[PDB]
Amino acid sequence: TVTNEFASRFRTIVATLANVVNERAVQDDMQKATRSCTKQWLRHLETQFD
């Protein structure tokens, strides 16, 4: 495969958690900067995992 199915699975997991944390952060009125930083952290986890 061009793409590792395990890594792609981790991408879907991180996508799900991303919209989860997002929904929470908008619920709790988080500053956009901190939100962007958690998202960046998740993308980093995806790369590391790949």
Among 7, 9, 24, 40, binds other proteins (CB under 8 A): 9
Work out what residue 10 binds among other proteins, its own copies, none; the CB cut-off runs from 5 to 8 Å by kind.
none
18, two tokens:
């991303």
d(CA 5, CA 29): 35
CA atoms within 13 A on the CB side of 9: 3
Under rule CB under 8 A, residue 43 binds its own copies: yes
CA 50 to chain CA centroid, nearest Å = 14
**What residues from 9 to 38 belong to the interface with its own copies (CB under 8 A)?**
11-12, 15, 22, 28-33, 35-36
Query: What does the binding site for other proteins look like in residue numbers (CB under 8 A)?
Result: 1, 5, 9, 12
